[PDB]
Amino acid sequence: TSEEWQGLMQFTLPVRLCKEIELFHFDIGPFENMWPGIFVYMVHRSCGTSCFELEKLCRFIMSVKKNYRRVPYHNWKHAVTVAHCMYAILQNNHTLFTDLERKGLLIACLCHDLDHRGFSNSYLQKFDHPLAALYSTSTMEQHHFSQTVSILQLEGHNIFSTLSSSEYEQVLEIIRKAIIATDLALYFGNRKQLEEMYQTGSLNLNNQSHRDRVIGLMMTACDLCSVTKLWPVTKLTANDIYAEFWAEGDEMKKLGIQPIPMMDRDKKDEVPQGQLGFYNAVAIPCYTTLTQILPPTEPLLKACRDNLSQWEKVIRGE
Amino acid sequence: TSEEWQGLMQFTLPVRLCKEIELFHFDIGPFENMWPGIFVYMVHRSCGTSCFELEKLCRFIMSVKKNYRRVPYHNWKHAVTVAHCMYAILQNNHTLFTDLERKGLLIACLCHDLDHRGFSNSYLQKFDHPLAALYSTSTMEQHHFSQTVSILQLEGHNIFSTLSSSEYEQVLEIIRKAIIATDLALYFGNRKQLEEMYQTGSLNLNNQSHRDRVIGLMMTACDLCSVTKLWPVTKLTANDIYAEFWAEGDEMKKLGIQPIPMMDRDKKDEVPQGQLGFYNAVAIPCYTTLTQILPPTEPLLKACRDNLSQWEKVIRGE
Amino acid sequence: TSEEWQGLMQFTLPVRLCKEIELFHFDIGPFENMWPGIFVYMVHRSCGTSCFELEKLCRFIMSVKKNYRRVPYHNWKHAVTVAHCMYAILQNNHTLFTDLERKGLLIACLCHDLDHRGFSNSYLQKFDHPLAALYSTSTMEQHHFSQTVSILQLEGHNIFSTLSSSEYEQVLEIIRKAIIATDLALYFGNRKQLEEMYQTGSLNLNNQSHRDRVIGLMMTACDLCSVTKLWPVTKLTANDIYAEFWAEGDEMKKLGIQPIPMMDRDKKDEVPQGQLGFYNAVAIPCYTTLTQILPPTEPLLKACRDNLSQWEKVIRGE
Numbered sequence: 034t035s036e037e038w039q040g041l042m043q044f045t046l047p048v049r050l051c052k053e054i055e056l057f058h059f060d061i062g063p064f065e066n067m068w069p070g071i072f073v074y075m076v077h078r079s080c081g082t083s084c085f086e087l088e089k090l091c092r093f094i095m096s097v098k099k100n101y102r103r104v105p106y107h108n109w110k111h112a113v114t115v116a117h118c119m120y121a122i123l124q125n126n127h128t129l130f131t132d133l134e135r136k137g138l139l140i141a142c143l144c145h146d147l148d149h150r151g152f153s154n155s156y157l158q159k160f161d162h163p164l165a166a167l168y169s170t171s172t173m174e175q176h177h178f179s180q181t182v183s184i185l186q187l188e189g190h191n192i193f194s195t196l197s198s199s200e201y202e203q204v205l206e207i208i209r210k211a212i213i214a215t216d217l218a219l220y221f222g223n224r225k226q227l228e229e230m231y232q233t234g235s236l237n238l239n240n241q242s243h244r245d246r247v248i249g250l251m252m253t254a255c256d257l258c259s260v261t262k263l264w265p266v267t268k269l270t271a272n273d274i275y276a277e278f279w280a281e282g283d284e285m286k287k288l289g290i291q292p293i294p295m296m297d298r299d300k301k302d303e304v305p306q307g308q309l310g311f312y313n314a315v316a317i318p319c320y321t322t323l324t325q326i327l328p329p330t331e332p333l334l335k336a337c338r339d340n341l342s343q344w345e346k347v348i349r350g351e
Numbered sequence: 352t353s354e355e356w357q358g359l360m361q362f363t364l365p366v367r368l369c370k371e372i373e374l375f376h377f378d379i380g381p382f383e384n385m386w387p388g389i390f391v392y393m394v395h396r397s398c399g400t401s402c403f404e405l406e407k408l409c410r411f412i413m414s415v416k417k418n419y420r421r422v423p424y425h426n427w428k429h430a431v432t433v434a435h436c437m438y439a440i441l442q443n444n445h446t447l448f449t450d451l452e453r454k455g456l457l458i459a460c461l462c463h464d465l466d467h468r469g470f471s472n473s474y475l476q477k478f479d480h481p482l483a484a485l486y487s488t489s490t491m492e493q494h495h496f497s498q499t500v501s502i503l504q505l506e507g508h509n510i511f512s513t514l515s516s517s518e519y520e521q522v523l524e525i526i527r528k529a530i531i532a533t534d535l536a537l538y539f540g541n542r543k544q545l546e547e548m549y550q551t552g553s554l555n556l557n558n559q560s561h562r563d564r565v566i567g568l569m570m571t572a573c574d575l576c577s578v579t580k581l582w583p584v585t586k587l588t589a590n591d592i593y594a595e596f597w598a599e600g601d602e603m604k605k606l607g608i609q610p611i612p613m614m615d616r617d618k619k620d621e622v623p624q625g626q627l628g629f630y631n632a633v634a635i636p637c638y639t640t641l642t643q644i645l646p647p648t649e650p651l652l653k654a655c656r657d658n659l660s661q662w663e664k665v666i667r668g669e
Numbered sequence: 670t671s672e673e674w675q676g677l678m679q680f681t682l683p684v685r686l687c688k689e690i691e692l693f694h695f696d697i698g699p700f701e702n703m704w705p706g707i708f709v710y711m712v713h714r715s716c717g718t719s720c721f722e723l724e725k726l727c728r729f730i731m732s733v734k735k736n737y738r739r740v741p742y743h744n745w746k747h748a749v750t751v752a753h754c755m756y757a758i759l760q761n762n763h764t765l766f767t768d769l770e771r772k773g774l775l776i777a778c779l780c781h782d783l784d785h786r787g788f789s790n791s792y793l794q795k796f797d798h799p800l801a802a803l804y805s806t807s808t809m810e811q812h813h814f815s816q817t818v819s820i821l822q823l824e825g826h827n828i829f830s831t832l833s834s835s836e837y838e839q840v841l842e843i844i845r846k847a848i849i850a851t852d853l854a855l856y857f858g859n860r861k862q863l864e865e866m867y868q869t870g871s872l873n874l875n876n877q878s879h880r881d882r883v884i885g886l887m888m889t890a891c892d893l894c895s896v897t898k899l900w901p902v903t904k905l906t907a908n909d910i911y912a913e914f915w916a917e918g919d920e921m922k923k924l925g926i927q928p929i930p931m932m933d934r935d936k937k938d939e940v941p942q943g944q945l946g947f948y949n950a951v952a953i954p955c956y957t958t959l960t961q962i963l964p965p966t967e968p969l970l971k972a973c974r975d976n977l978s979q980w981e982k983v984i985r986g987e
């Protein structure tokens with residue numbers, strides 16, 4: 034049978050990639066046509082060779098790719114990068130997650146920014162974009178999930194067709210919650226709740242609502258993982274995100290609205306302090322809380338701390 | 352019938368767009384996939400819901416889009432922007448124009464820079480491009496019109512198929528003259544003639560040759576309308592046009608010809624004075640004459656004057 | 670017959686192009702859709718109107734184009750530029766080369782960088798790219814040749830189908846050797862051998878191994894021909910190559926490897942001295958040796974010398 038022949042197959046990467054893909058700070062490289070293979074490899078190792086039908090998975094992956102846009106940061110490379118961080122979390126906490134969760138979370142990460150235009154929820158609201166009329170909150174994130182379902186609905190694209198309806202409904206809910214959780218506006222309340230539950234000892238991974246919250250934080254951690262890379266990667270990637278943000282600031286000015294310094298290219302000089310503030314207020318607390326809940330995710334926090342030190346070095350003119 | 356069902360249809364934009372599209376200084380925004388709908392809306396309001404068969408118009412619009420190139424300024428965004436300025440002129444002088452003219456002029460504006468390479472007529476002549484051998488004068492503009500006719504000749508693309516042959520010939524002549532008029536070399540003589548006829552009182556919109564001249568000036572006014580936007584739009588758009596011009600200057604240098612300061616990136620510092628000179632010699636006289644002939648086009652002149660003041664502020668180092 | 674109708678055909682370029690295409694320092698221009706015609710013209714003049722079936726050649730050319738990538742330097746424009754330099758060498762040494770060699774070398778030049786990613790052999794090795802596992806030496810160059818053969822194997826793409834098998838095997842060997850010779854690592858040993866054989870008088874174009882070496886040097890000369898253009902062309906093209914090199918340097922830093930100053934954008938200021946060193950160590954000796962072997966290639970050396978002077982002028986701050 035087809036599933037039998039698939040069980041005999043072994044998917045391998047080049048030697049350096051096989052070794053370094055296990056590291057949290059792995060960078061996927063500039064060879065775009067290797068990314069699909071990298072994702073398949075990760076799915077194989079974290080889920081199993083029989084989790085997805087290979088032909089369907091490849092078809093799905095290429096369609097997801099086609100539905101990411103040629104924008105500076107929120108692109109296909111970001112999608113695979115976020116997926117890899119999830120892989121590393123899964124592999125280092127392999128005891129904790131079900132079959133459905135491993136399937137669902139890697140797919141959720143790959144799909145989490147589908148059809149991103151390089152503009153924030155705030156801008157879409159102020160422009161009065163049709164998406165903002167349909168989705169009052171988490172505008173882009175609800176769209177990302179809608180795009181995911183649409184791709185799954187294409188002929189030969191349902192990678193979950195081997196699942197029972199019950200399991201299918203569960204995995205789609207996992208994916209939905211995970212993608213919505215990438216709305217950074219929702220992160221602040223989520224992390225606060227998680228910190229409180231952790232300190233009191235009420236936090237319980239057997240409780241579905243608590244489990245959803247931890248998955249949420251994992252999604253934030255993966256989404257921001259560019260700050261957990263080695264310095265050259267982190268610093269160069271910052272150029273990409275600011276390219277998007279400054280373009281949005283330009284568009285804000287065209288609406289006759291003064292953008293916040295973050296989106297304003299005239300405030301270029303304040304970038305190092307802006308990043309410092311972001312690490313202090315968002316990135317460090319995220320990875321700190323994550324490391325408390327899932328201790329094997331410690332390398333993410335260490336690398337984030339190292340990058341904070343690098344930004345401090347930039348500020349001092351050193 | 353199909354035309355009956357179309358009469359029942361109402362095309363609407365988002366609230367902010369419905370309001371602000373009526374303003375001369377409206378900016379069409381960064382969401383490319385909304386531009387076709389914006390054009391259809393404008394056609395509906397200025398011409399009527401029964402002017403074009405919707406299916407044919409949409410097919411036409413997408414083919415026009417496909418025949419604009421990925422250049423910094425003379426692109427699809429410019430085409431829709433010029434079309435919008437015409438819409439605003441038409442709507443504020445709604446009493447003056449025939450059914451054919453409203454149809455023709457919006458289409459002419461949409462098509463007026465079709466297949467632009469980002470190079471001037473001068474460069475094509477000096478390179479010895481095949482187009483310069485075919486069209487001795489108004490080289491690119493004659494090509495733009497040729498492209499328009501070719502698109503109209505495609506199966507299911509004749510948006511004027513409901514017209515009599517007589518009316519079809521008239522609308523094509525309207526379009527031809529309008530597109531040729533966008534050759535800025537022809538603007539100077541046209542505006543001079545118009546000014547003289549206006550001051551003596553010989554100018555008569557019932558005279559076809561006079562009417563052609565006024566339409567010509569309207570085309571210049573729409574073509575240059577980026578100078579009639581709010582300052583942030585006008586200033587940022589200047590970056591796009593200079594990207595094209597400097598690339599042409601580079602190509603001139605490659606032919607062993609010293610380009611004029613306008614096309615020379617080494618003369619970056621002279622941009623503010625260059626713009627001032629352009630507003631004084633071209634833009635202000637254009638909108639001044641247009642406002643004299645068509646008083647409701649006054650906001651274009653006011654906004655142009657405001658931008659002149661902004662360039663003066665740049666020059667002073669303020 | 671078809672070949673009879675082809676014999677009656679005359680392919681012509683615009684007047685300026687017909688004249689200036691014969692000059693070594695000709696630049697192919699910014700009009701991409703003219704490059705195929707320029708190549709066909711060159712094939713017609715250097716080989717003959719009956720060398721290739723026109724329909725097949727056009728199909729081949731467009732497929733080659735499609736297999737070059739949108740990178741700053743190693744692109745479709747580079748391919749045609751290298752092909753033109755070969756044309757000029759062939760036309761000025763028209764007595765020396767066989768029918769097969771003229772066919773083969775123009776095609777080899779057009780195909781010599783097929784599917785280039787904008788990264789060096791060194792980077793592919795350090796990344797551990799699958800291509801480096803397949804080709805231990807001349808990694809990209811072996812791939813370029815593999816791509817060439819694959820394109821030739823496509824239905825209706827075998828431009829050599831009129832050749833006997835013996836002649837087909839010969840032309841493919843000519844192409845293979847020529848493309849491999851564009852590996853600059855191999856140039857140093859080749860030029861040294863050629864210089865020694867020239868000075869002793871052992872160099873003999875009737876000896877196949879010697880002939881292969883001279884063709885090799887011709888390939889290096891064509892590959893580097895951007896340094897033999899007029900100053901504005903040479904200087905602007907330098908921007909393109911450094912865009913690629915600096916991107917590679919970025920990627921090196923992402924691997925945790927300090928790149929050499931050549932690939933490091935932080936060493937921007939050292940570009941003029943870097944170019945001077947390159948002209949001294951590589952470019953001048955290449956064209957010097959080539960001019961010794963083939964005296965009519967003298968203009969390449971003169972133009973290279975002129976550009977060396979220009980870089981010296983940059984260094985002095987003049």
Ligand SMILES: OCC1CCN(c2ncccc2Oc2ccc(Nc3nc4ccccc4[nH]3)cc2)CC1
Pocket residue numbers: 217256257259260266267268270271274278294295296300301302303304305306307308311
């Ligand atoms: O190192 C690359 C990563 C940096 C953080 N990344 C972000 N992810 C999600 C949202 C925003 C991200 O980047 C930021 C975060 C904070 C800022 N804050 C900020 N405030 C500023 C004030 C003045 C000037 C610049 C400023 N940047 C800017 C960009 C992803 C890529």
Ligand SMILES: OCC1CCN(c2ncccc2Oc2ccc(Nc3nc4ccccc4[nH]3)cc2)CC1
Pocket residue numbers: 535574575577578584585586588589592596612613614618619620621622623624625626629
């Ligand atoms: O604000 C954006 C609009 C500016 C005017 N636009 C033009 N439209 C048609 C032709 C030329 C346009 O832009 C100009 C106009 C005049 C100049 N003149 C000029 N002379 C210069 C001398 C030295 C240095 C720069 C110079 N620019 C440059 C660009 C469209 C976009």
Ligand SMILES: OCC1CCN(c2ncccc2Oc2ccc(Nc3nc4ccccc4[nH]3)cc2)CC1
Pocket residue numbers: 853892893895896902903904906907910914930931932936937938939940941942943944947
């Ligand atoms: O003028 C345009 C041509 C310049 C030479 N070109 C090259 N072709 C093949 C390989 C490398 C080419 O460009 C070079 C050659 C040498 C260098 N060397 C160099 N060393 C440097 C040290 C510090 C800073 C910059 C440096 N560049 C850089 C680029 C093609 C385009």
Ligand SMILES: [Zn+2]
Pocket residue numbers: 145146173215216
């Ligand atoms: Zn997102």
Ligand SMILES: [Zn+2]
Pocket residue numbers: 111115145146215256
């Ligand atoms: Zn994201």
Ligand SMILES: [Zn+2]
Pocket residue numbers: 463464491533534
């Ligand atoms: Zn034009």
Ligand SMILES: [Zn+2]
Pocket residue numbers: 429433463464533574
């Ligand atoms: Zn225009």
Ligand SMILES: [Zn+2]
Pocket residue numbers: 781782809851852
């Ligand atoms: Zn090469």
Ligand SMILES: [Zn+2]
Pocket residue numbers: 747751781782851892
């Ligand atoms: Zn090359």
